[PDB]
Amino acid sequence: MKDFTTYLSTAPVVGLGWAIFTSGLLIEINRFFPDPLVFS
Amino acid sequence: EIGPKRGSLVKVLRPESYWYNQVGKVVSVDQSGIRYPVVVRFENQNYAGVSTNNYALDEIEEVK
Amino acid sequence: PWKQPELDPDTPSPIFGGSTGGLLRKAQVEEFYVITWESPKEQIFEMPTGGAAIMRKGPNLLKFARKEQCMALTTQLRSKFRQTPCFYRVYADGKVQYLHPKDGVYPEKVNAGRVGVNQNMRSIGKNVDPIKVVKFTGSEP
Amino acid sequence: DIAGLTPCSESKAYNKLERKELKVLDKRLKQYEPGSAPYLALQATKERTENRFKTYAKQGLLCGNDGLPHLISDPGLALRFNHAGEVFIPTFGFLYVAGYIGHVGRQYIILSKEDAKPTDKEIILDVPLALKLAFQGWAWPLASIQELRNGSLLEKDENITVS
Amino acid sequence: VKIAVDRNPVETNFEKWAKPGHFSRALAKGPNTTTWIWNLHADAHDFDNHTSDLEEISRKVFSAHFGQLGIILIWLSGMYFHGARFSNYEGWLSDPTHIKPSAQVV
Amino acid sequence: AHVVKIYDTCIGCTQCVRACPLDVLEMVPWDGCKAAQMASSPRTEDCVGCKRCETACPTDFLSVRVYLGNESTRSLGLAY
Numbered sequence: 001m002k003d004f005t006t007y008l009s010t011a012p013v014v015g016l017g018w019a020i021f022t023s024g025l026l027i028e029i030n031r032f033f034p035d036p037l038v039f040s
Numbered sequence: 041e042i043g044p045k046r047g048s049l050v051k052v053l054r055p056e057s058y059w060y061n062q063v064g065k066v067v068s069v070d071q072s073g074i075r076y077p078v079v080v081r082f083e084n085q086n087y088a089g090v091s092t093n094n095y096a097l098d099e100i101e102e103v104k
Numbered sequence: 105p106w107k108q109p110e111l112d113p114d115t116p117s118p119i120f121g122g123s124t125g126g127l128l129r130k131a132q133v134e135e136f137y138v139i140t141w142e143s144p145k146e147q148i149f150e151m152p153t154g155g156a157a158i159m160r161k162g163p164n165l166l167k168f169a170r171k172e173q174c175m176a177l178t179t180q181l182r183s184k185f186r187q188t189p190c191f192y193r194v195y196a197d198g199k200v201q202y203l204h205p206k207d208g209v210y211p212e213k214v215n216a217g218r219v220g221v222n223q224n225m226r227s228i229g230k231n232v233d234p235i236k237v238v239k240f241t242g243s244e245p
Numbered sequence: 246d247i248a249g250l251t252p253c254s255e256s257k258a259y260n261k262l263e264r265k266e267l268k269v270l271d272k273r274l275k276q277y278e279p280g281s282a283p284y285l286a287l288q289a290t291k292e293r294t295e296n297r298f299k300t301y302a303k304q305g306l307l308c309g310n311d312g313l314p315h316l317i318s319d320p321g322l323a324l325r326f327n328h329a330g331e332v333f334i335p336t337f338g339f340l341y342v343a344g345y346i347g348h349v350g351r352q353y354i355i356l357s358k359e360d361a362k363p364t365d366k367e368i369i370l371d372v373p374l375a376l377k378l379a380f381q382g383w384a385w386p387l388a389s390i391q392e393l394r395n396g397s398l399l400e401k402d403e404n405i406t407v408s
Numbered sequence: 409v410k411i412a413v414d415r416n417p418v419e420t421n422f423e424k425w426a427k428p429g430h431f432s433r434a435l436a437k438g439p440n441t442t443t444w445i446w447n448l449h450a451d452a453h454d455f456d457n458h459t460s461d462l463e464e465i466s467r468k469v470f471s472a473h474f475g476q477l478g479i480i481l482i483w484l485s486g487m488y489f490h491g492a493r494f495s496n497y498e499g500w501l502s503d504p505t506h507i508k509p510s511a512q513v514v
Numbered sequence: 515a516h517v518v519k520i521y522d523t524c525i526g527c528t529q530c531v532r533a534c535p536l537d538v539l540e541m542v543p544w545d546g547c548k549a550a551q552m553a554s555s556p557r558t559e560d561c562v563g564c565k566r567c568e569t570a571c572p573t574d575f576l577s578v579r580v581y582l583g584n585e586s587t588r589s590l591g592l593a594y
């Protein structure tokens with residue numbers, strides 16, 4: 001398990017979790033309060 | 041003793057070198073009158089892949 | 105060496121059917137190179153130009169158009185079969201020149217007879233700028 | 246108003262563009278049945294389109310002769326004529342986020358280089374450390390001016406030169 | 409002609425997943441330049457360069473080919489599935505000429 | 515007709531001599547190094563300007579440099 005967690009700490013995997021967060025956050029930020037252009 | 045101490049860090053002053061104004065460990069020093077006795081080892085590689093090079097007394101100075 | 109070995113232009117050649125990488129009109133007109141060596145048995149080796157050939161027990165001789173084609177073969181024989189080849193240079197006039205083991209010892213081993221050539225007593229860099237030699241040739245010499 | 250631009254509420258081409266974009270959906274809506282899912286999808290798009298146009302008008306935007314909204318960048322005219330949210334305020338929002346990425350990566354680089362084998366820490370990250378710094382960077386401007394006024398931000402001629 | 413197998417040659421564990429570049433002697437040292445990264449993804453499946461043994465090269469090849477089949481079969485099953493749940497096959501089947509196919513709803 | 519100059523930083527590795535195919539580099543004794551060896555370039559007329567030697571040099575910067583210049587039949591590697 002120590003080696004599995006180490007594999008998960010590689011660059012390709014940590015980047016995959018980052019991408020799901022940033023993309024998931026932005027798509028969710030467009031789904032709610034739809035299509036923003038001016039900021040109030 | 042002719043030169044810096046074993047295991048002592050020193051800063052390089054060759055303008056040609058990849059390691060210029062950079063720090064490296066002194067691996068050894070020869071006291072037989074050679075022109076470039078001081079052997080130095082750095083962690084960072086150069087462009088070829090070599091991490092050691094023999095420098096001179098005047099070309100090296102104290103750290104930082 | 106003790107003495108330069110003169111060329112024996114009539115020695116048996118390897119068993120090789122022929123190819124298209126052989127000699128061209130430059131060889132008869134300008135110069136060509138020939139290599140000699142002595143093998144203990146009958147073996148197979150890769151030629152620089154073309155395919156495979158069979159050596160012959162005893163002296164062997166080839167003819168090439170380039171020095172690199174010859175030295176490429178020495179590196180193969182010295183490594184694979186552990187032999188000691190020697191090659192010459194033949195001009196169109198018939199003159200012959202003995203090139204590679206010119207001292208008898210290969211260049212990667214020191215010998216007392218040799219004299220240094222093109223030896224600058226300075227560090228790389230540390231040489232004059234081109235402006236100082238602007239109107240004649242050479243900043244490195 | 247400013248720069249010879251009309252507000253989007255008073256413009257005719259702005260409303261012309263609304264009547265056009267809705268007419269495309271109404272024609273597309275005629276094909277399908279009322280209670281079907283394609284009908285619900287197009288009605289939602291109709292609802293979003295009607296909301297996009299009224300919100301841009303309500304926000305005091307400026308529409309040109311073509312009928313499309315234009316943005317203003319000078320903070321003086323933006324603040325004078327109430328157009329600050331367009332560009333002037335988006336600039337501060339981004340800089341806080343951009344600085345956060347810099348202050349975080351700079352700290353992970355410095356701290357891993359204080360240990361043995363920093364090369365391995367780049368390809369195989371220390372995720373507990375990276376998350377720690379990522380949640381400590383909310384006040385990145387304070388640390389920068391703290392590090393500038395102190396002098397431990399910049400290096401001093403211990404860098405490689407070429408000549 | 410007969411069957412010939414060697415039992416339990418390799419242990420299965422994630423130890424080498426943590427150590428990239430294990431297959432090559434040069435890469436197992438570790439990275440000091442970013443060129444080590446490009447060489448890694450490139451020399452990964454060049455089994456002939458890893459080792460001189462023809463046997464190991466054969467074991468690696470015969471097992472990697474089993475991967476491409478699994479990769480194909482989930483791809484092929486995806487088309488059947490995506491054609492079942494997100495398509496108009498039953499409608500196209502009754503009027504093929506006028507109706508067009510559609511397996512990718514957005 | 516290329517130019518090959520070796521500088522004061524040579525350490526007698528012999529890797530330059532082993533590499534260059536055309537036998538344009540040989541080793542000569544010298545008192546400057548630990549190995550008591552130095553290279554030389556007696557026959558540059560046979561230099562093809564491949565520049566393999568410079569690659570062999572394992573010093574911070576090259577003690578052997580091949581300054582390209584005027585060409586010739588031997589330098590251009592022409593079998594014809």
Ligand code: CLA
Nearest residue numbers: 011014015017018020021350354367368375376379442445
């Ligand atoms: C061939 C060109 C080249 C290549 C291949 C690289 C490659 C790399 N560089 Mg780089 N670099 C280059 C040129 C190049 N560089 C040049 C020309 C310069 C100018 C000198 C730099 C300057 C530079 C700097 C200053 C840095 C790099 C770094 C890196 C590494 C970054 C890896 C990474 O992004 O971490 C992973 C990707 C991420 C997005 C990390 C995000 C982490 C977040 C906080 C995790 C949160 C997500 C969470 C864990 C998951 C939740 C998901 C859930 C919702 C499901 C990488 C190996 C960086 C490094 O050292 O690595 C750390 C570094 O700081 N480079």
Ligand code: CLA
Nearest residue numbers: 010011012013014015016018019367368369425428445449
């Ligand atoms: C399965 C296929 C696959 C693919 C497509 C990739 C693709 C990639 N790997 Mg890799 N990897 C794989 C398998 C794979 N890997 C395997 C089997 C291993 C052995 C465990 C590794 C181990 C490995 C290591 C050790 C490293 C990579 C790195 C990289 C990236 C190269 C660096 C770069 O160009 O961006 C340069 C990046 C910058 C200049 C700044 C960082 C910003 C990045 C782009 C954001 C993160 C992108 C994110 C990962 C994309 C999502 C993944 C994507 C494939 C869908 C690249 C995206 C390098 C890396 O740093 O990853 C990012 C790296 O160091 N991989």
Ligand code: CLA
Nearest residue numbers: 346347348349350351352353354370371374375376378379
């Ligand atoms: C902490 C990481 C980091 C930091 C603090 C900086 C900082 C800086 N960079 Mg830079 N750079 C980085 C990474 C980083 N870079 C990487 C990974 C690359 C390879 C793509 C580059 C390539 C690069 C170039 C070509 C240039 C700069 C330049 C600059 C300077 C101006 C800002 C800019 O526009 O850059 C550009 C910004 C990018 C190219 C985006 C970088 C990619 C992401 C967004 C940043 C990486 C964050 C890291 C992966 C996350 C690790 C966090 C950790 C906790 C895991 C500035 C001081 C410019 C300069 O020379 O200054 C005058 C310039 O020309 N950078």
Ligand code: CLA
Nearest residue numbers: 409410411466469470471472473474475476477478480481
């Ligand atoms: C009826 C006998 C038989 C059958 C049906 C197959 C079938 C197959 N062999 Mg094969 N083989 C056989 C005898 C057989 N072999 C014998 C006797 C030897 C040694 C003398 C070999 C040695 C051999 C090698 C070295 C390789 C194959 C490979 C393959 C696959 C190539 C995939 C392809 O391109 O086509 C179409 C693909 C398909 C139709 C997919 C079908 C997938 C299922 C699982 C096929 C299972 C049938 C299997 C042979 C029966 C045994 C299963 C049982 C022991 C549990 C294929 C499925 C290649 C491989 O490994 O594939 C990855 C490969 O490199 N075989």
Ligand SMILES: CC1=C(/C=C/C(C)=C/C=C/C(C)=C/C=C/C=C(C)/C=C/C=C(C)/C=C/C2=C(C)CCCC2(C)C)C(C)(C)CCC1
Nearest residue numbers: 011012013014015016019020023024025026027028029031
């Ligand atoms: C093997 C391998 C790997 C893998 C990779 C991959 C595979 C990647 C990718 C991936 C992908 C490919 C991803 C994607 C993602 C995400 C997304 C894509 C998103 C999202 C979400 C959302 C947010 C949504 C929402 C929604 C909508 C849209 C509408 C409404 C409804 C719902 C809610 C659904 C790596 C290299 C890493 C590591 C090692 C090797």
Ligand SMILES: CC1=C(/C=C/C(C)=C/C=C/C(C)=C/C=C/C=C(C)/C=C/C=C(C)/C=C/C2=C(C)CCCC2(C)C)C(C)(C)CCC1
Nearest residue numbers: 033034035036037038039040300316330331332334335338
């Ligand atoms: C929608 C809506 C809403 C709101 C929302 C929100 C949340 C907001 C926001 C937000 C934001 C915040 C947005 C934005 C904006 C932005 C923009 C608009 C941008 C831009 C860009 C720029 C400005 C740029 C420029 C330039 C150029 C052009 C060149 C140079 C470079 C530069 C970049 C500078 C509400 C609530 C009412 C509800 C209903 C609907």
Ligand SMILES: CC1=C(/C=C/C(C)=C/C=C\C(C)=C\C=C/C=C(C)/C=C\C=C(C)\C=C\C2=C(C)CCCC2(C)C)C(C)(C)CCC1
Nearest residue numbers: 318319320332333336343344345346347348351385389390
């Ligand atoms: C406001 C505004 C404006 C104006 C502008 C101007 C005109 C100004 C400027 C400018 C300038 C003339 C500037 C200068 C200089 C700068 C500098 C010098 C900088 C910077 C940076 C640094 C120094 C660093 C940073 C960082 C990094 C990169 C990483 C680490 C950390 C930190 C974050 C710190 C406009 C209208 C356009 C638009 C709207 C807004």
Ligand SMILES: CC1=C(/C=C/C(C)=C\C=C/C(C)=C/C=C/C=C(C)/C=C/C=C(C)/C=C/C2=C(C)CCCC2(C)C)C(C)(C)CCC1
Nearest residue numbers: 019021022023024025026027028030478479480482483486
């Ligand atoms: C063959 C194969 C496959 C395939 C795969 C694929 C094909 C994938 C993909 C995918 C894709 C192709 C995706 C895409 C995507 C995209 C995304 C996910 C996005 C995003 C992002 C964001 C978040 C944005 C943001 C923004 C806005 C909104 C505004 C401002 C600007 C920007 C742009 C920044 C599989 C694996 C299945 C299986 C095996 C085999």
Ligand code: SF4
Nearest residue numbers: 524525526527528530
């Ligand atoms: S390759 Fe360089 S260091 Fe080695 S013997 Fe020749 S000149 Fe000296």
Ligand code: SF4
Nearest residue numbers: 534563564565566567
């Ligand atoms: S240029 Fe080529 S042939 Fe001439 S000495 Fe250098 S490596 Fe040898």
